[model samples]
Target: ASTDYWQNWTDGGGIVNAVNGSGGNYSVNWSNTGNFVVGKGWTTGSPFRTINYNAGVWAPNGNGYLTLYGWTRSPLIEYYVVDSWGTYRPTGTYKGTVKSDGGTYDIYTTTRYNAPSIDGDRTTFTQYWSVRQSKRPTGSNATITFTNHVNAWKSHGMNLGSNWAYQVMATHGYQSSGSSNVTVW
Candidate 1:
């Protein structure tokens, strides 16, 4: 069967926020900040670099990597890293409510690769884009339409980068309310 037709709106909102932000900006910021850099060192010659204060660690070029230095040192807390799969799991459930527009319904999906590898060599890769639209009938059934796209760039053979892909799913149609159980899979 076609992909399930769902209203992106979850309990707080739609999948846009669920799949994207973690409740608010602060959570989102914390998630990326802690998870993006942990155990990940900047490659040499990268325009961006980071330094650790514990050892007075400095950049190779006498520069410091961009970091939340102020946040790093705090009595309340410090940096957090995603060490295990559990760290990336969703903390809560998602329930979506669709807006009723007569009997018709529509959900829009937009996707883009974040920090996609632009440099094509032997072991560097990147993403392109993928999107789709889903529709549901008044009191009947629903169907989803997907968009196809090719990779933006080709790398030799390397793992994808963090935050390399982003997808936003939104809804626009008649008003309706529905909820679903979502577990980090």
Candidate 2:
């Protein structure tokens, strides 16, 4: 099965060695000295469905812990399931951790007030993070138990977005650099 594949970037070195395949599958390498997102998945994610990935060569750098990256609307949110990273990690008010997909994760919630977003509204939006305590071993397959993460976030007083945007297993960057080879379904 082939999912919707999209790529968008701004003010950065172009991606090299980028490969996209069927069913939420894509791989790319870039200096990523800017904000960028490229991957495959449903245009709108369903909380009922889950995402699994066979991630290979997930070598990344300054790289905004590029892993499972996506956004939501209504509440207008950006979220991540960080399986790996480089240099530093995203920091916020500690919201505890949740054990899922065979690993433990640190939960952090950060709020952005009047920040611009994919959505028309630039109102307040929350960021949900479940940064893995340990990086997912490269060249291995794993599942991102979506429900589990959502439940954990909700418990922390983070409300769910009424609508989800793209849900892709891709490399995401912010003044960051990185590369990855991945297949998602």
Candidate 3:
């Protein structure tokens, strides 16, 4: 991982840390979170981007996820391609599912009205989700066919706005504790 690839977001007393591992690897640890997320990836995430990853997560209390996290501008959209979850999975309006890398993702469309966004506090945005129905196991090498997911999202009327933003393989914890080590390319 490069110096610029790491990202962190925390609120309400969460403790989070990120360390660059190499060209395409990084590690993160977080605890006692209201909302905490950290990891590494693209400086400018765009459509058609695919990722190959190997990662391990340890979030025993089950209030978090290991996911592909990012944002897009214009409409200020946030998105997740969730790989594995701790206890419960997040949900919204169950849009549907998309197939990729030999699996089907449960698609969801969620509104983050007046919530924190890339712009700042109190900014509104849409969140696109593609959650793995059959969660991937930890420490496994896998491919996220992001191109397919995004295309499927567009087909379902879920637009990602007009500009790209940072995308990372992140481990996020909310009211929980966890750590992760990941490599993406």
Among the numbered candidates, top TM-score falls to: 3
Candidate 1 per-residue C-alpha lDDT over 1-185 given as tens digits, one digit per residue, 9 for 90 to 100: 11112222212222212222222111111111111211112122111222211111111111112111111111111111110111111111112212222221212222223322223122322222111112121222222111101111112121123322211112111112221111110
Among the numbered candidates, top lDDT falls to: 3
- Model 3: which residue pairs collide? 1-22, 1-23, 62-87
Where model 3 places Cα greater than 4 Å from the true spot, the runs are 1-4, 58-60
Q: What is the C-alpha lDDT of each candidate?
A: 0.18, 0.74, 0.80
Clashing pairs in 2: 2-23
Worst 10 residues of 1 by lDDT: 69-78
TM-score on alpha carbons, each prediction:
0.15, 0.86, 0.91
lDDT of each residue in 65-113, candidate 2, tens digit only: 6567778888778888888777777768889899988999999988888
**Can you write out model 3's per-residue Cα lDDT over 1-185, one digit (the tens) per residue?**
24246777777576667677777787777677787777777888868777778885545465888888999888788899998888888888998889888888899998876677877678667899999997787777888878899889989999887788898888877887677788777
How close to the true structure is residue 106 of candidate 1, measured as C-alpha lDDT?
19
* Higher-scoring candidate on lDDT, 1 or 3: 3
Give candidate 1 misplaced runs (Cα > 4 Å).
Answer: 1-129, 133-176
**Backbone clash tally (model 2):** 1
C-alpha RMSD in Å of predicted model 1 compared with the true structure: 21.4
Model 3 poorest 10 in a row by lDDT: 1-10
TM-score of 2: 0.86
Number of clashes recorded per candidate? 19, 1, 3
